[PDB]
């Protein structure tokens, strides 16, 4: 009894949103390119101590948390499979923003996200095959976008490199560039919120089951907490710990949405078409809440 | 059977870094898996 509004995915508003998101990505990456340095990235890649910790934390906490949340809340097979697919996904590129708002080591946020989206090529089908047994009796190894992952990695690294060279060579226009980036990001965010609201309409009221909301709100917080705790167990300096926490918590959500749609028909998925959106709107909320808490603490310290 | 170019800041299937933006239009050629799975074990808690 769940059906999306007619002609979903092809109306002009959805095209407007899908074009606005690309400008979001380009200008966010260009702005973040004004913080990183090539020499420090080379140092962080030639002395891998926080990078391995980030990889271990992400790929040993997020999939296991997804599996445990599926087995504890007594979810359906399709819901548990969606959660598990949304767990093994790479770190994504919101971790860079959340580690910028918390005074992290930006150069390492780029090593962990590029390396953990290139290790994803190998470790996403492996973890899916290891964990999906007893849930799905099928092949999910040929539906992972390998070529898409590589192309996305290169296309995401391009604007960051542009920003890095701009900072290194011509710092005269850096202030204007960063101000324009911030204002464009703000405008495109105000655009995205209202455009997504109009696009979704009343069809989201069918995708707010208490189990779905509870799991999609408990997964990112547990990711944050466990990433921070495990990074602190290895006595890191206080900034790498926050970067690791905010890279373990945040996930590349679009991969789950493009895998579920390829594997399953629109009627089997049902309300789970909106679960990636719930994950995004809860991880944004938790990131903002933690940023506010951190800044309130830093004021008093 | 999946050549979608994912967008990190995305939450819908039609959020891809393709300049042609053919996913939002008709005949979107990004999922070459016409043999979907209608599996009946999708409402069982086990």
């Amino acid at each position: 009894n769940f059906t999306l509004p007619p002609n979903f995915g092809k109306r002009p508003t959805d095209l407007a949103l899908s074009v606005i998101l690309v400008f979001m990505l380009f200008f966010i990456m260009l702005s973040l390119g004004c913080t990183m340095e090539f020499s420090k990235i080379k140092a962080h890649l030639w002395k891998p101590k926080g990078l391995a910790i980030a990889l271990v934390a992400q790929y040993g906490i997020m999939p296991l948390t997804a599996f445990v949340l599926g087995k504890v809340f007594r979810l359906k097979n399709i819901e548990a499979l969606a959660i598990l697919v949304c767990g093994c996904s790479p770190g994504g590129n919101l971790s860079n923003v959340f580690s910028l708002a918390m005074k992290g080591d930006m150069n390492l946020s780029i090593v962990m996200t590029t390396c953990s989206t290139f290790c994803a090529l190998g470790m996403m089908p492996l973890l899916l095959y290891i964990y999906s047994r007893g849930i799905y009796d099928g092949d999910l190894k040929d539906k992972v976008p390998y070529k898409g992952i590589v192309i996305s990695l290169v296309l995401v690294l391009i604007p960051c490199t542009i920003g890095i060279v701009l900072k290194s060579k011509r710092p005269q226009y850096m202030r204007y560039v960063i101000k324009g980036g911030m204002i464009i990001i703000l405008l495109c965010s105000v655009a995205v919120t209202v455009l997504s609201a109009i696009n979704v309409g009343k069809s989201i009221m069918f995708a707010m089951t208490p189990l779905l909301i509870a799991t999609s709100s408990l997964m990112p917080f547990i990711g944050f907490l466990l990433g921070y705790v495990l990074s602190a167990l290895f006595c890191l300096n206080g900034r790498c710990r926050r970067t690791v926490s905010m890279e373990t918590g945040c996930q590349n959500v679009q991969l789950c949405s493009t895998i579920l749609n390829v594997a399953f028909p629109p009627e089997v998925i049902g309300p789970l078409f909106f679960f990636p959106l719930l994950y995004m709107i809860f991880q944004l909320g938790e990131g903002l809440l933690l940023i506010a808490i951190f800044w309130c603490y830093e004021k008093f310290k | 059977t999946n050549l979608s170019v994912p967008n990190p800041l995305g939450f819908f299937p039609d959020h891809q870094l393709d300049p042609a933006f053919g996913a939002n239009s008709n005949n979107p050629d990004w999922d070459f898996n016409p043999n979907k799975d209608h599996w009946p074990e999708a409402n069982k808690v086990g």
Partner: antibody
Amino acid sequence: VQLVESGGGLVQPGGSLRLSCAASGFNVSSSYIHWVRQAPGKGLEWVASISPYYSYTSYADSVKGRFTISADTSKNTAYLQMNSLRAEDTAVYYCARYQYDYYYSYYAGLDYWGQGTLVTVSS
Amino acid sequence: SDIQMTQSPSSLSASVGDRVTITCRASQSVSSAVAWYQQKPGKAPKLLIYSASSLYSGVPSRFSGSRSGTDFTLTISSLQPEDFATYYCQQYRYSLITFGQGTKVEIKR
């Protein structure tokens, strides 16, 4: 409950023909209408399917890109439109429903079939 | 990419009152989503068994279904003069439905 087909006839190769499936006794807006083709003196074959409620449509491998299936919830009919009919497409076409089982939640046998309209293509 | 079926007996011949066992084997795990049809020559197919073990309403009690992993069987308890026709095997747990080759039960002499 019954399904009726119409539009079977002689079509030259490369031509186009439209088959209608005038469903009666239920509503196509929710059902799952299938088209099944039987070559003369051969076993049954599958052609195309429609799920109008979800607007999800899948075609077989042999007729992918040449056959178009539609639904008309206003007139309670299902249409299969073919293009570039090769000489090997001459057969009898059946319209089939999709039973739903409530005790075990999934689809059941294709209960109701139409009589079938002979589509023969030859120059 | 299609899910092939390998209906084993092609032209099984059995006289009146015997036992008939037609075996359909799926190349991939299709769960319990196999149906058995009985197409008499010159008429539209009917439905006999759905979900590979149940029984469609109106079918006599002679027919039966089974499933052993990926192997599906159809058993006729006692053949009747109206049981001589062609039987097909189907699948559900995949978008592209694939039928079977067909088993023609003919009289013996």
